[PDB]
Structure formats: structure tokens, C-alpha cells
Amino acid sequence: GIDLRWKHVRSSHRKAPKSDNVYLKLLVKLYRFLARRTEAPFNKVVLRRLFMSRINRPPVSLSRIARNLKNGNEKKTVVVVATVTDDNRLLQVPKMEVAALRFTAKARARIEAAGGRTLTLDQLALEKPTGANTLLLRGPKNAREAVKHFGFGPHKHKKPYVRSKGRKFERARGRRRSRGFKV
Amino acid sequence: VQKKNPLRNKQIMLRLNPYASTFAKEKLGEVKAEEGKPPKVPASFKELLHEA
RNA sequence: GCCAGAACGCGACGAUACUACCCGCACGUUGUAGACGUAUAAGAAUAGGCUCCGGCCUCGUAUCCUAGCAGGCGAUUCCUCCGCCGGCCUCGAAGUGGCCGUCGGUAAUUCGCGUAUUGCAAUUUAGACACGCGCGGGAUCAAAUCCUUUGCAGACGACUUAG
RNA sequence: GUCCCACCCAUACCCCGCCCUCAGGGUAGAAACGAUGCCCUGAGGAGUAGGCGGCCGUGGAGGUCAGUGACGAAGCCUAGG
RNA sequence: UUAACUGAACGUGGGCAUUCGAAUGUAUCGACACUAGUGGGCCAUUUUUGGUAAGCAGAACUGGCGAUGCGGGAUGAACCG
RNA sequence: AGACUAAUCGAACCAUCUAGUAGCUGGUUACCGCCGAAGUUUCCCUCAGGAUAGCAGUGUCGACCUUCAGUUUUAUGAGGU
RNA sequence: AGAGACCGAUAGCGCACAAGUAGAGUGAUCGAAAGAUGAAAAGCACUUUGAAAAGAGGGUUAAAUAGCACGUGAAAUUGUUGAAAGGGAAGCGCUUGUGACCAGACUUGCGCCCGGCGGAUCAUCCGGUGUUCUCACCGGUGCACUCCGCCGGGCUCAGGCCAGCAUCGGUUCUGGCGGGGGGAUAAAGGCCCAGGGAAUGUGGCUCCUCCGGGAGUGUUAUAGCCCUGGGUGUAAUACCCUCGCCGGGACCGAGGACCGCGCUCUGCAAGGAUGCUGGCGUAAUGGUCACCAGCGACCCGUCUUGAAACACGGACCAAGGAGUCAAGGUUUUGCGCGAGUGUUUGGGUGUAAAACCCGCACGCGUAAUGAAAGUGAACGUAGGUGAGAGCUUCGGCGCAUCAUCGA
Numbered sequence A: 001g002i003d004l005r006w007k008h009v010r011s012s013h014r015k016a017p018k019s020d021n022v023y024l025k026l027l028v029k030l031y032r033f034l035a036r037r038t039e040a041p042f043n044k045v046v047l048r049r050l051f052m053s054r055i056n057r058p059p060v061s062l063s064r065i066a067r068n069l070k071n072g073n074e075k076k077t078v079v080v081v082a083t084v085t086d087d088n089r090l091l092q093v094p095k096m097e098v099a100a101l102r103f104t105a106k107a108r109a110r111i112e113a114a115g116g117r118t119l120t121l122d123q124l125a126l127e128k129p130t131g132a133n134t135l136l137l138r139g140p141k142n143a144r145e146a147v148k149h150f151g152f153g154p155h156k157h158k159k160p161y162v163r164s165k166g167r168k169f170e171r172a173r174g175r176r177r178s179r180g181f182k183v
Numbered sequence B: 001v002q003k004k005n006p007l008r009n010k011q012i013m014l015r016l017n018p019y020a021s022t023f024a025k026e027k028l029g030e031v032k033a034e035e036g037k038p039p040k041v042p043a044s045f046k047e048l049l050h051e052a
Numbered sequence C: 001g002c003c004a005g006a007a008c009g010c011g012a013c014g015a016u017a018c019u020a021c022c023c024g025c026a027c028g029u030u031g032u033a034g035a036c037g038u039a040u041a042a043g044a045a046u047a048g049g050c051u052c053c054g055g056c057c058u059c060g061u062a063u064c065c066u067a068g069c070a071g072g073c074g075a076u077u078c079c080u081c082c083g084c085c086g087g088c089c090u091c092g093a094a095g096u097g098g099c100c101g102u103c104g105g106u107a108a109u110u111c112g113c114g115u116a117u118u119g120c121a122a123u124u125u126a127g128a129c130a131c132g133c134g135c136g137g138g139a140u141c142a143a144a145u146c147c148u149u150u151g152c153a154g155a156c157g158a159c160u161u162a163g
Numbered sequence D: 001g002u003c004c005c006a007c008c009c010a011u012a013c014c015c016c017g018c019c020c021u022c023a024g025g026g027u028a029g030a031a032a033c034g035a036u037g038c039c040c041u042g043a044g045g046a047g048u049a050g051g052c053g054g055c056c057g058u059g060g061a062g063g064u065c066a067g068u069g070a071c072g073a074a075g076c077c078u079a080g081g
Numbered sequence E: 001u002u003a004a005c006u007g008a009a010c011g012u013g014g015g016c017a018u019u020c021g022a023a024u025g026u027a028u029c030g031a032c033a034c035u036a037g038u039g040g041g042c043c044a045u046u047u048u049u050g051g052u053a054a055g056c057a058g059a060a061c062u063g064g065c066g067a068u069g070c071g072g073g074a075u076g077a078a079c080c081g
Numbered sequence F: 001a002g003a004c005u006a007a008u009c010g011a012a013c014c015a016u017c018u019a020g021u022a023g024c025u026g027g028u029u030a031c032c033g034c035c036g037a038a039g040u041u042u043c044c045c046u047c048a049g050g051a052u053a054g055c056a057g058u059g060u061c062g063a064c065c066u067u068c069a070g071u072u073u074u075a076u077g078a079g080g081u
Numbered sequence G: 001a002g003a004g005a006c007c008g009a010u011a012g013c014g015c016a017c018a019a020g021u022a023g024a025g026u027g028a029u030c031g032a033a034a035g036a037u038g039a040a041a042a043g044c045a046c047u048u049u050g051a052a053a054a055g056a057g058g059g060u061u062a063a064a065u066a067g068c069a070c071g072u073g074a075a076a077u078u079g080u081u082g083a084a085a086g087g088g089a090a091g092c093g094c095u096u097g098u099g100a101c102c103a104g105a106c107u108u109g110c111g112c113c114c115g116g117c118g119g120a121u122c123a124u125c126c127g128g129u130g131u132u133c134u135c136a137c138c139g140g141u142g143c144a145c146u147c148c149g150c151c152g153g154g155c156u157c158a159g160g161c162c163a164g165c166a167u168c169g170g171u172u173c174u175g176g177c178g179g180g181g182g183g184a185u186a187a188a189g190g191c192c193c194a195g196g197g198a199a200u201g202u203g204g205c206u207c208c209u210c211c212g213g214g215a216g217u218g219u220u221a222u223a224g225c226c227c228u229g230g231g232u233g234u235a236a237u238a239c240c241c242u243c244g245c246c247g248g249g250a251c252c253g254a255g256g257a258c259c260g261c262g263c264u265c266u267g268c269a270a271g272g273a274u275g276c277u278g279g280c281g282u283a284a285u286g287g288u289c290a291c292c293a294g295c296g297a298c299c300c301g302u303c304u305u306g307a308a309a310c311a312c313g314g315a316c317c318a319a320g321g322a323g324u325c326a327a328g329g330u331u332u333u334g335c336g337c338g339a340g341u342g343u344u345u346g347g348g349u350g351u352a353a354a355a356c357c358c359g360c361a362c363g364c365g366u367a368a369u370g371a372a373a374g375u376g377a378a379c380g381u382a383g384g385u386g387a388g389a390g391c392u393u394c395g396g397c398g399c400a401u402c403a404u405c406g407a
């Protein structure tokens, strides 16, 4: 006997994509080579985010990009391993260059109409094989309707599972002091 | 590919400790004590020993 | 004393056809809880014994036998040791030993010829009992069951009887 | 009752081989690779109720082997591989 | 708040490894999501309640059997290894 | 006599509602690999049953965060066996 | 009337057949089993045995191993033949033995030299055509020391099964020998020097017995013993610790060009076994089965704290036999589009239940909060502080997310 608390412990993180996209497999082969033959920490981060599922790759809009193009980042290259969407609230688009996994049709048209350019993640590896003069951006992970229901309980202020909204749907006993108690 | 044991294989011992050959050649494990006529127990160490 | 009698315990006796039996020879188509010098007889005491009558005993750490082509062929030499037969005695706990005779073999001494080639190891195929087969000689000419019958017996078999 | 030597054997301990599981590395100016492959290194392996992974079989459907077959398809028997 | 810029909380600027201020390990850090089975237990050293007592009935800390083979106790769920 | 009403009577026989309901007994079909329990808390016309917390598996994500610990040491509190 | 990713005779309707039939009940009502010779009956003429049913011959057929008890013809259970075991169950696990039966492997291969035989045309150059643009193919030349094939002879190397010896590597068991250190620098002890004692009193002296002896007396004499110092002496030996050197056995050989650390450095025992030799080339090694032998081995499924249980189900075999489908929720994986998204209620069209095309409404989402009348999201570069991957002109900028103060 050896008296060990743990044995045959498996890793907690993904080691390959779960998708079967043929072109995503070509992209993964490229960045496996780059991460092994370069010392840049940038390349290792991009490889890991290519394994992730869609709820771990939330979208990023043009407004969120414009917020981070201030205070001396006007001429860096924006890198987003996700979809880039359009924002109707933003009326004037600044000029920029962005490398993204994919663009929506209107997002791509507004970037180029302001004098910018759009790249693919394989075009980025050819121009910046070490990730120099770049900024990495992520979208909001918790801005999902399902996360509002997590951890429901007393004195937690979370969202309940109900079939409708109105006065007759879970508002009487346990929600106000005029009927028993409150939460 | 195969661990070999010094204290049985002399070539391995010389690889790890180049002073081994000198130690054996000069017989450093058989050094004699310094000369000198020794005194005797001072006649009261012996009295206490058999005291009771 | 009295009842049963091991259905895988034993003894004595009678008659034994069928080569079933006996003797001799030669083979293996064979089996064996396991040959390889398968060598050794006093009785008794243990705080006492043995003896050749001189002595001797912790001790079988003994005694016998033991050489030669897996053991040849001759000589020199010796009168020892071994075996198959035959004749007399002897042996009863589950039957054994001794004496004598003919015949065959035989380094206690010393030699002459032969050994190879199984190739640098491979069980040293070797003993003793059983059994089978084939010859050549001797000896021998028997019973049991069914069946019929009895009632000293009996569910049926079996049993006591007669033909 | 107390003390002292030598010896016997567990799936336990030590060394070696092989299987699997987990972990960590190498491999493109490609004389290059079932890159889902190959090469190097270390540790681990008991299990009911229960959870997950990978694989083997059966009846039908699309595609493909320009597949087998009356010179013998399918089925059945076989101390033969 | 105090008679009172006197205090109370939160700070700018500056100084201090010439040593970030016991030992050992790190053979397994943090946070989240979804769900299975279970909800009759029993045994033992020490401590303990009722009972004359019980292979009786009831508790505390820890270790076991249940869910588990192997070497010992001839046998022997729980004892020794 | 709760007796008899076609071997049927303390409420006949036949078809349908009907696959009537069961906190209760019985069964529930190939292989290998890795991890691995509970009989305890609170509430219930609750005591052979449920919900709820714990114990277990699987999927991940954040950094590979000087990060932790069924342990010792040093200083300093509480307790009525 | 047309069809199907439906079932294939214990299935599919109760019924693929003279099936709502045969049969049961007074009656209302209940209600089965049962498909397949061969292409064609060519469905066995004649002889013989038997009372007959039938048998034996002889015919038909591609086949009677298809004869109306009819395609194929499994298991439970039974007969004959063959092999084997058995002293109050049998069956099973590990490991030898005997008997029977059996799959592989091996039979040669490449190379060099010598001779014979046959055929070409080997190298080079000229013309044409391809192609990876320098590499090839076809036609012509070549014409015996070149090229190709066969046969004969010799030589090296590699090759199948089981074993023996020598030199090494890894692990381990077990004998023997040479040194060093320590303690009261072992303690004792032998020999020598000086002092002091006694008795289980040596020799002498006395008494008792001659009957072997005994009893007194006293300090080394004709034996000896015990204490205390000193010398040889740093004596020896035991015990504990430690540095090396020689023998004897057992099990194992993973890896496959070189590369490294080293040494006793023409080389080697240094990042894992080679060299030499014999027998046999097949049932010899090896495998399957049956049986005897040594050791081991309680009947499965299930409920249970506890099952081999005097706890329940199970005589045997074949075929059937149990977490499914729909609507509505939820979390997680893959995919399309993305502030939007969803053609298919319907219309157009068609090679016609397919595939293709169209867009008015509508659903979910884009805004909340109150019982309701109602009202309705920027002081600031969409705020300040502490952490924070990544980038950086090295001054800093700071995603996601967490804690905190505000709007």
C-alpha cells in the first residue's frame, strides 16, 4: 500500500476543440506549431481560446471596441477570438484594424466604410507572428439570461422560474409581510 | 537505460568521484595513531569505579 | 460357556474332460509407489557387561567384498574363492538349513598381443519377480445348472431330499 | 517460568520483464505524417449501490466495394486449426 | 465629534530587504453548473446510563464490517499481520 | 340454518367502464477501462414512505494566482471533569 | 383504387387453410389448433417371403440423404457400435505424467570467381517527341576485354529445434584472508621486585588405630593460596566500529547505425550479450483431449446488520419476454444568422406525399416598476478605490471576473 489521497487525477481543461469544422482544424494546427516554436505568451492564449465552446466565447460589439481604443491605443491591432457584432447606438465609427474569428455582415461593412480593414486569424499570424502591438478583448461572460437563475434561494435576489408575469404568479406568501412573512 | 551500482562497478565510481583512486593508493583508511607514551588513570577514577 | 462369521481373512482334503495340468528350452506383444555391492541372525543387564581367561568396552569412525573389452586371447604361476547338478540327513509360527561327490569357472606373483573414429557431455537401454507366446517331452479322461421330485423348508429366490 | 542461536512461508517490502491509466516533453524554410501518427521520461492499479468512456453483436435504410454465388448462397453438425 | 483642525474614517508625497521577519510538507489552488444512490445498520479498545444479569436496551471520540480478497487464530462477517 | 336461489351466496351469473389504484412482494437480457457512497440534520396524520442538507460522478472556466494544511513550536485567552 | 425505412406462420387481425369454423355452456355469451413432395406424378410395373400390415430384390428421378408420417431437420430424451473410469455423490482451479490425435518451421537465398551455351547491343554520338527545363523515351550507329539470360564447378556470408563451455553486464545468497580505531589506551594472565594476611593448615612436632586413618599445634619448610603497590608494557586476546582483497552457486539479456559521462587511454568490464562447439532436422521441441496422482474448491438468483443454511423461486430443452412514445420545462455539447430571428396556417411550382421559391400578419427578444390610476433609466472620456491575463514608446494602458463606495 501507498496511502495516497488521490490517484489517476485527470486534467480539468480542454485539450482539443469539440467541433468538427475542417477549417478550424487547420487553424488549430497552425497555432500548435507557433506556440511550440515561439516564446511569445500571446500565442499560447490564442490556442486555448480556439478550443472553447460558444458560451465561453461571447460576442463583442463595435461600441465595446471603441471604449478600449482610448488613452493611447489608437494604432494597435484588436484581436477577438469570437464574433464581432454591430451596434446601432454608435453613430460614428472610428477607423481601426481588427482580427476576428468572424464578422457579421453589417459589422464588416461599417469598419471598411470608415477607412479600416478586417483580418482573419490566419492573416494575423502572417503579419504579427509574435503578437506585437496588439490588444486582446473578451466579451461579457455573465450577460446571459440563464445566469440570472443561478443560485436561487432566500435573501438572494435572483430570478425565479415562472410561466408568466403578473399579480397572480408568486407574489403573496413569502414575498410581503401582509401575507405571513417576506422571503 | 540501466542503472549501475558504484561500490560494485569501479568504472562508475571513478566517473562520480575522481579522488577514489588516490584514497585507495595512499591507504587513507589505515592511518595510524600519533605516537606518544600514554599516562594512566589518576588513581581516583578507579576508586570511584569500584566504590559501592 | 452362548449367537453371527470378514460376502476383497486363513488352513486341510477329494476329483479335475477341454493341450485346462507338470517339466525343459527359447523369445517379448507385456506389468510392477520405483535394483544399480539392494552384503552382515546370539540372549540379556544399563547403580553393569563381553571373553580365546591373556585381557577388553565413549564411538558401526566397524567387518566382508571390491583391479582385467560392461572386463578379450595366450603364458608364467597358485590350491584359494564361486556356481549348476546329484545323494544323505534336517526343518511346521507363514517349514529351512547342513554334509558329501562329479562337473564348470577362477591375478596370491609377473608378462606379451588387442582397445582409437561413440569425433569435447546427452539413462551406463544391464536386476528381480509376475504375465503372455512358440516348440519338445510327460501325466489325465471330471463336474455344475436348467428339468422332474420331496416338505424336516418357503412371499419370490434360497434350503433339506430323490432321479 | 525466563534467556539464546539457526531455520520455514503471504497477493506485504526490494530488483527485472510485459499490459493499461494518468502526468510531462520532442517532431516543417517539411528527404513529409492513418499530426486522430511516431519517439523519450516518471508514477499508479481492491470494490456493492451508483456515475462516465470505449468497444462487440442483431432486423431494416442511403452511398460504396465495377464484392461472393448452381464449378454450390444461407442454415445445421464437428474431444480439427 | 470636540471649548477648539481637537479627534474619527478614508488618502497624496517620502522612507524601510545590507535579510518580506518560527518548523515541516505542498503525492493535487479557487469558483461554478447539472444530477445519481442513500435516509432499517451492526462490532471493538477507553469513557459511560437502566438492569441481578444477558450473544439485553441506550449515548461520546476514534477505528472497522457492510462494499474485501490474501497469511495466521483446526473451524469462525468484525481479532493479529 | 345467514339457509336456499343450476357442484357458485354475510348479496348469483355474463359482457363493458378496465391495461381500475397499490407508500407493498417478485423480475428487469453483451464485454472491458477509470472514479466511488449512505443508514445522519430539519419539516411532514411523518414511524415499511417523501422533501431538504450532507456524502458521489461528470462537464468546465480563472490563474498555472507565494497557495494552502484533521501537524509541531513560540506568545497570549477561556473551562469546573 | 394506389402506396410504405411496417410483420414474415408462438409474428401480423381471433382467422394466410371447408374461421366467427370445430368444440363448451340451460342461457346471455366463450372460442381454438392447423401454410412448404418434385421442373414434371414420372405417386414404384414385375419376382419372391408372409394369414395380413409389411419386408427383400428390381424400377422412376439431377436427388428417394425428396415416398404423400413428404424442403432444410437444431436441443431436451433414446438404441447400436467404439474408447475409458468407478471402496457411502459428481462436477471444478493450479501443476507434472501416460495414451491418442495434430498446426507450424525447414527443403535454401544473395554475392564473388572460373568454364560452356544462347541472344543481343553495353558506352558514345545524330534525328524526333515528351517533361519536373534537365531528366527521359523512340528511330539510327554500335558489332565482341561491352550488356542480358541459362547451365556446370569452387568460395565467403546469412539461414530451423534442443543443449554444453569461455569472457562480461544486472540482482542476490554464501565461504575465506590482510590491515586500522576505541575502552581502566580492555579487564585478566605468565615472569620479576616489595609489603601484609589467614585456612576447607603443606612439611614438621604431639596423641589416639595399625585397621585404612583421625584429632591437635601453628603461617612455608619437602605443597600452595588470598590482599596492596611497581616493571616488562603503547604486551596479547575478547567485544564494538571501520578500509580493502580473493573464492562458490542461482535467476535474468529489455534496447538496436554514430552522438554522452569517463578510464588503468594502439584500446577498455565506460548510455542493456556476445564468442566457440556438439546432436537432430522430425512429431524430437510444441499444442488439443481423456484419465490417474499432490494441493485447493459448500448452490445459484434475492430481501437482509448477517445465507451453504432447518429462509423463499428453480425437474429438463427450444422459441417469446420488461425504462418506451407525445406535449410542455430545464442545464450542457455541435451548427446558422445576429439587434434581430423563425419559408412549409397559406400561395407559386414540380420529373408530384420529395426537392425548389414567396411574404402580410404573428410569436419570442430589444424596458422596468406598482394592487391600481400611472410614471419610466448619462454630473463625469458611461464614475472612484484594490487585485488582474495580455500589450507597452518601459512612463504606463489595462479585457473577463471578484471585493468595495457612489450616480
Ligand SMILES: [K+]
Residues within 6 Å of the ligand: none
Ligand atoms: K388577511
Ligand SMILES: [K+]
Residues within 6 Å of the ligand: C068
Ligand atoms: K588385459
Ligand SMILES: [K+]
Residues within 6 Å of the ligand: none
Ligand atoms: K445496426
Ligand SMILES: [K+]
Residues within 6 Å of the ligand: none
Ligand atoms: K471641525
Ligand SMILES: [K+]
Residues within 6 Å of the ligand: none
Ligand atoms: K440527494
Ligand SMILES: [K+]
Residues within 6 Å of the ligand: none
Ligand atoms: K433524499
Ligand SMILES: [K+]
Residues within 6 Å of the ligand: E040
Ligand atoms: K434495524
Ligand SMILES: [K+]
Residues within 6 Å of the ligand: none
Ligand atoms: K444487538
Ligand SMILES: [K+]
Residues within 6 Å of the ligand: none
Ligand atoms: K481465518
Ligand SMILES: [K+]
Residues within 6 Å of the ligand: F006
Ligand atoms: K349456471
Ligand SMILES: [K+]
Residues within 6 Å of the ligand: F023, F048, F049
Ligand atoms: K408503507
Ligand SMILES: [K+]
Residues within 6 Å of the ligand: F080
Ligand atoms: K465541581
Ligand SMILES: [K+]
Residues within 6 Å of the ligand: G014
Ligand atoms: K391465433
Ligand SMILES: [K+]
Residues within 6 Å of the ligand: none
Ligand atoms: K352448445
Ligand SMILES: [K+]
Residues within 6 Å of the ligand: G062
Ligand atoms: K444439376
Ligand SMILES: [K+]
Residues within 6 Å of the ligand: none
Ligand atoms: K435410387
